[PDB]
Design a protein around this ligand. Structure first.
Ligand SMILES: [Zn+2]
Ligand SMILES: [Zn+2]
Ligand SMILES: [Zn+2]
Length: 178
């Protein structure tokens, strides 16, 4: 197995996947690495299994249909994986914890949002449809763009949103378009 965490790329107390060579810190994996279970399969492996069991799940889908799906076990897992893919980017550090807003010439957002809040919301089964998760994720980046206005720091929001959107289209097999 790898000797660094797949998500944060650091060594430490790592849990090893039994079906692929990835490793994880306990709370870097989403969901948090399960207490017992030998063998243990990571989320990359679990997602791969879903695909392999239902190859047709990779045919193109309309975003509007994906968003109305109820958060049954497979959709819950797919949102956890998508969240994890965003944490895999080092730029996620800017969006992880609760923000605060005190900049001359801007006003903070009406509804602040951050990754760790989305992570807690998923853990607590607070989303009933995929739309709830996706709306909160997109709101993270929208709030950032609006607050930072013309500061070049706005680009971090564009960058991490692009990671989000690419992974959303991949995980939920959104129909490719120009
Ligand atoms: Zn880690
Ligand atoms: Zn694995
Ligand atoms: Zn099938």
């Amino acid at each position: 197995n790898s000797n660094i965490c797949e998500v944060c790329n650091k060594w430490g107390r790592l849990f090893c996947c039994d079906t692929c060579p990835r490793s994880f810190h306990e709370h870097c994996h989403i969901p948090s690495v399960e207490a017992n279970k030998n063998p243990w399969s990571c989320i990359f492996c679990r997602i791969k299994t879903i695909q392999e069991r239902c190859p047709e799940s990779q045919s193109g889908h309309q975003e509007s249909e994906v968003l109305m799906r109820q958060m049954l076990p497979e959709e819950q897992l797919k949102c956890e994986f998508l969240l994890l893919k965003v944490y895999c980017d080092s730029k996620s550090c800017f969006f992880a914890s609760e923000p605060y807003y005190n900049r001359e010439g801007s006003q903070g957002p009406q509804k602040p949002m951050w990754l760790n809040k989305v992570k807690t919301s998923l853990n607590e089964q607070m989303y009933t449809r995929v739309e709830g998760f996706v709306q909160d994720m997109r709101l993270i980046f929208h709030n950032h763009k609006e607050f930072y206005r013309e500061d070049k720091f706005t680009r971090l929001g564009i960058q991490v949103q692009d990671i989000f959107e690419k992974n959303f289209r991949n995980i939920f097999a959104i129909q490719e378009t120009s």
